[PDB]
């Protein structure tokens, strides 16, 4: 049993492995925003008062979905908060509608938005999603902090008068530029290049 001497023996065999990759969370955030924009532009977004139903029968929910989305809808993603936006009757009714998929606000992805043609979102869930999207940069630390008890910026102080007068005078003196080599030698004597990689 060796390569080229037996069927089923390989020189470079396929190996089990993890196929997951890594992506920037900022890219995921931006992609979610782009997906919402695309759904709005292509008219695949509907906003609902709530998903509370008084009957558990699948047929009634199917009729409601058909009334809202028509008879030619390929598939739908139903987004809710979970507590007071939807009820067990709705969860029972949708359990056998293979064209629709229920999700909470936490599980919304570009993948889901692309997979399911229509997006039907309650107002509460829509506001929750908007808040999460808008506050994500603060949570991930992509925005500046101000090291104040309130966390807001502090006033910018004024500059002390004459703080740069000596530097201005030195520049005015040097701008004659006729003693170039003399100034160069003075600088060579005064200053030293550092051998460290960090700092001055």
């Amino acid at each position: 049993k060796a390569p080229g001497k037996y069927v089923g023996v390989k020189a470079h065999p396929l190996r089990p492995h993890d196929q997951r990759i890594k992506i920037n969370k900022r890219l995921l955030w931006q992609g979610l925003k782009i997906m919402l924009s695309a759904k709005f532009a292509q008219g695949q977004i509907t906003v609902v008062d709530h998903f509370n139903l008084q009957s558990h029968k699948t047929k009634h929910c199917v009729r409601h979905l058909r009334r809202l989305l028509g008879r030619k809808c390929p598939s739908a993603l139903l987004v809710h908060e979970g507590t007071t936006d939807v009820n067990d009757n709705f969860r029972y009714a949708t359990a056998h509608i293979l064209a629709v998929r229920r999700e909470n606000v936490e599980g919304i992805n570009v993948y889901n938005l692309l997979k399911y043609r229509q997006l039907v979102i309650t107002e509460k869930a829509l506001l929750k999603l908007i808040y999460n999207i808008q506050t994500y940069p603060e949570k991930r630390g992509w925005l500046p902090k101000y090291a104040t008890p309130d966390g807001k910026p502090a006033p910018a102080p004024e500059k002390v008068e004459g703080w740069d007068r000596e530097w201005r005078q030195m520049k005015e003196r040097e701008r004659n530029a006729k003693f170039s080599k003399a100034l160069l030698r003075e600088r060579i004597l005064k200053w030293k290049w550092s051998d460290e990689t960090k700092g001055a």
């Binding site: 160069l184 600088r187 060579i188 200053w191 290049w193 990689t197």
Partner: peptide, 12 residues
């Protein structure tokens, strides 16, 4: 350590 090489001329 990713040190970017720098060139110096006439103490600049």
């Amino acid at each position: 350590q990713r040190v970017v090489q720098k060139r110096r001329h006439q103490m600049r």
